């Protein structure tokens, strides 16, 4: 346990980075959202105190219980209303295959989750089998797309061969054209599809794309204009293969910037200003 | 040359088709039952209080739907819960940022935090893989001398011991028996539908994520086996079915 003592040292130092990284992230979000929280929730009270004055003969003390039972309904697919009390299935022939696609990709929006105990015991096994299953598809799609990218770069790697185009530095031009194409084909072009057909802004589509393809976790949901749902699960498959490489390159960038800063502090703790 | 991805593609498509037909068979019954009882509870309430009516109540539903998008959240802790979701990609959509700056931050915060957290989880996986490597070394002497199949007893003790330390024992810290195991699997498969109480719970995640990371990879190894086992099995069956057609030609 000589290198294993050197392992725990490296892990513990990373642990404190993630902790602080999460502390930085926390303080940033609460500085950006709790302003927008208080604003809406000072106006949710105005709408309560509006509607209790507007209709006093409703049960004040039991109205919140009506609100809670609507919120307790919200977790399941509910759009309860008198005009069009007749409704449509969130577990129809397709929306359950949307759901299955979420579970194996581990995207899992949680927009709809199974309520049956048979659906839970199936989903557990369906995930424990589907997640590794989908992995080998995604890996093959990554290799399939990595050789497609390997084909296109070979032609680009001959178009501008000048005198001693430095081998170490050509690899940077190649990774620039990767991010350039990739963040058009899997970020830009499909996101603009989610702006005319779903009704979003420019950010909210790119935000949607990153949240989904970073498998954090809807395109099938909002409806403006059945050619549209089968194709999106192909962009997901290849886009997930894309960010898988994108997140992995960023990981490689973080190794570099770890050792460069690790040796840098090494010299500054050596010299102490001459 | 040989693609071999297309063949997998059709399995996943087929697997998703089976899974789909199973879920609607399990949920659309439990869907109709609820939503016929939701209409009864509404048609009770409109009759129980004529003070409220159709044209009022829909406005009450809309202002709850308008509330849904927001709902103290985002407090000093609930934003670091949120950040913990984004880097682990568990990402419970329980709370999501509404500000344009919170979205542009979250994008970059994920693009940087997900790989970052990966190296933590990787080291925790190696740290826990040698801890598991310690425990097996002593088990590999207590009865391995006494009377390829030993490797199964070891992986049985893995599932046995790990699905107590990371599923059963923690389960409450965080219902019923199912609802805890369902919770554990959903969370640690990253699907996600010295002082205060906060720090210790978040390390169960870290080590439990390292646990299912090995569990899911082990299952991947069994799928690779069962792929080759069935790959060669059809291999023989097409050999005999051809020689079967060949004999009726000669004889
Ligand atoms: C092994 C070659 C991979 C093919 C993927 C590139 C697609 C190029 C688009 C034009 C050709 C469409 C072929 C459709 C294949 C079902
Ligand atoms: C709730 C259903 C999941 C039970 C998992 C049991 C695992 C048994 C493994 C046997 C492999 C041959
Ligand atoms: C890697 C080169 C593949 C070229 C395939 C052609 C696709 C159509 C491009 C249209 C250019 C006008
Ligand atoms: C009912 C079993 C579901 C698994 C999918 C069938 C496995 C065989 C696929 C064909 C492989 C060559
Ligand atoms: C979020 C940036 C943190 C930088 C860590 C440097 C500590 C040596
Ligand atoms: C904000 C830049 C993150 C890089 C951190 C490096 C940790 C060694
Ligand atoms: C809106 C532009 C996002 C910039 C991403 C940078 C990640 C390193
Ligand atoms: C690189 C993954 C190997 C998959 C096994 C395929 C052997 C025919
Ligand atoms: C050829 C792939 C076989 C997949 C078997 C899956 C069993 C759950
Ligand atoms: C809930 C029993 C399992 C069905 C596949
Ligand atoms: C080296 C690329 C940085 C993009 C923000
Ligand atoms: K995930
Ligand atoms: K997720």
Q: How far is the CA of B11 from the centre of ligand 4 (A)?
A: 7
| B108 pocket-lining for ligand 7 (C-beta < 6 Å) | yes
Q: Which of A179, A190, A196, A181 is nearest to A250 (CA)?
A: A179
Containing H/E element for A249? helix A229-271
All residues at 6 or more sequence positions from B71 whose CB lies less than 8 Å from its CB, including other chains = A40, A41, A44
Interacting residues of B136 by C-beta distance below 8 A, sequence separation 6+:
B154, B157
The beta-carbon neighbor of B38 closest among A58, A73, A89 is A73
| Segment holding B89, helix H or strand E | none
Place of tokens 């299912």: B212
Nearest chain B Cα distance for residue A61, angstroms: 14
The span from the CA of B83 to the CA of A272, in Å, is 37
Measure the CA–CA gap between A199 and A222, rounded to whole angstroms: 8
Chain mean position to CA A56: 45
Non-local (6+) Cβ contacts of B148 within 8 A are: none
Touching B: A residues 175-214, CB under 8 Å = 203-204, 206-207, 210-211, 214
- For A108, list phi and psi in degrees, rounded to 5: 50, 70
Largest CA distance in chain A: 87
| Contact present, A52 and A60 (Cβ < 8 Å) | yes
- Phi, psi torsion values for B240, nearest 5 degrees: -75, -35
> What angle (nearest 5°) sits at the alpha carbon of residue A101, between those of residues A178 and B168?
110
**Annotated binding residue A175:** no
Helical ranges in A106-228 per DSSP H: 117-159, 167-182, 189-196, 202-213
- A81 and B87 in contact by Cβ < 8 A? no
Q: Give the angle B111-B69-B182 at the CA atoms, nearest 5°.
A: 70
Contact assessment for residue A32 and residue B97, using Cβ atoms and an 8 Å cutoff: yes
How many Cα atoms are found within 13 Å in the side-chain-facing hemisphere of B11? 17
CA-A24 nearest atom, ligand 5: 1
Residue ranges of domains in chain B: 1-251
A176 CB under 6 A from ligand 5? no
Nearest CA to ligand 6 atom 7: A258
Q: Tell me which DSSP letter residue A222 carries.
A: S
How many helices (H) and strands (E) are present in chain B, helices listed first?
A: 7, 0
The answer to whether residues A184 and A191 touch, using CB atoms and an 8 Å cutoff, is no
Q: Tell whether residue A142 is among the known ligand binding residues.
A: no
B38-73 in b/e form (b: 16+ CB < 10 A) is: bbeebeebbeebeebeeeebeebbebbeebeebeeb
Residues of B in Cβ contact (< 8 Å) with A229: none
A124 touches ligand 10 (CB under 6 Å): no
The answer to whether A196 and A222 have CB atoms below 8 angstroms apart is no
Contact criterion met (CB < 8 Å) for B75 and A40: no
Breaks in chain B (C–N beyond 2.5 Å) sit after 71, 147, 174, 193
Cα(B185)–Cα(A124) distance, rounded to whole angstroms?
Answer: 7
Q: Please tell me what resolution, in angstroms, this structure has.
A: 3.5
Question: Does the distance separating the beta carbons of A77 and B31 come in below 8 Å?
Answer: yes
Cβ atoms of B191 and B210 within 8 Å: the answer is no
Convert B158-169 into a string of H (helix), E (strand) and C (coil). HHHHHHHHHHHC
> Which two three-digit tokens encode residue B180?
């805890």
For residue A136, the distance in angstroms to the closest alpha carbon of chain B comes to 8
**Residue A8 neighbours by CB under 8 Å, 6+ apart:** B127
A:12-41 residues touching chain B, CB 8 A cutoff: 14-15, 17-18, 21-23, 25-30, 32-37, 40-41
Q: Give A272→chain B minimum CA distance, Å.
A: 31
What is the Cα–Cα distance from A174 to A162, expressed in whole angstroms? Answer: 15
Question: Would you tell me how many other CB atoms lie within 10 Å of the CB of residue A186?
Answer: 21
Closest ligand 10 atom number to CA of residue A121: 1
The pair of structure tokens assigned to A269 is 């703790």
- CA–CA dist A243, A229 (Å, integer): 21
For A215, residues 6+ apart whose C-beta sits below 8 A from its C-beta are A105, A106, A107, A240, B89, B190
Q: Is A251 buried (19+), middle (13-18) or exposed (0-12) by CB count in 10 A?
A: middle
Whether B52 contacts chain A with CB within 8 A: yes
Q: What is the DSSP letter of B49?
A: -
């Amino acid at each position: 346990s000589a290198i294993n003592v050197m392992k725990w040292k490296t892990v513990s130092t990373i642990f404190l980075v993630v902790v602080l990284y999460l502390i930085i992230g926390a303080t940033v979000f609460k500085a950006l959202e709790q302003p927008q929280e208080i604003s809406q929730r000072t106006t949710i009270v105005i709408q309560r105190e509006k509607f209790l004055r507007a209709h006093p003969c409703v049960s004040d003390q039991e109205l919140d219980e009506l609100i809670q039972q609507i919120v307790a309904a919200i977790n399941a697919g509910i759009i309860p209303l008198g005009a069009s009390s007749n409704q449509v299935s969130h577990w129809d022939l397709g929306s359950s295959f949307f759901f299955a696609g979420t579970v194996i990709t581990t995207i899992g929006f949680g927009n709809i989750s199974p309520r049956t105990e048979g659906g839970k015991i199936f989903c557990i096994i369906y995930a424990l089998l589907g997640i590794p299953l989908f992995g080998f598809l995604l890996a093959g799609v990554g290799d399939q797309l990595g050789t497609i990218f390997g084909k296109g770069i070979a032609k680009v790697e001959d178009t501008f061969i000048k005198w001693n185009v430095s081998q170490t530095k050509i690899r940077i031009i190649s990774t620039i054209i990767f991010i350039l194409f990739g963040c058009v084909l899997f970020v830009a072009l499909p996101a603009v599809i989610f702006k005319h057909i779903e009704g979003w802004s420019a950010l909210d589509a790119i935000y949607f794309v990153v949240i989904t393809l970073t498998t954090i976790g809807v395109a099938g949901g909002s409806d403006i204009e059945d050619f549209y749902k089968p194709v999106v699960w192909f962009w997901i498959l290849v886009g997930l293969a894309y960010f898988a490489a994108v997140l992995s390159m960023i990981g490689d960038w973080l190794r570099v910037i770890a050792k460069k800063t690790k040796e840098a502090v090494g010299e500054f703790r050596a010299h102490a200003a001459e």
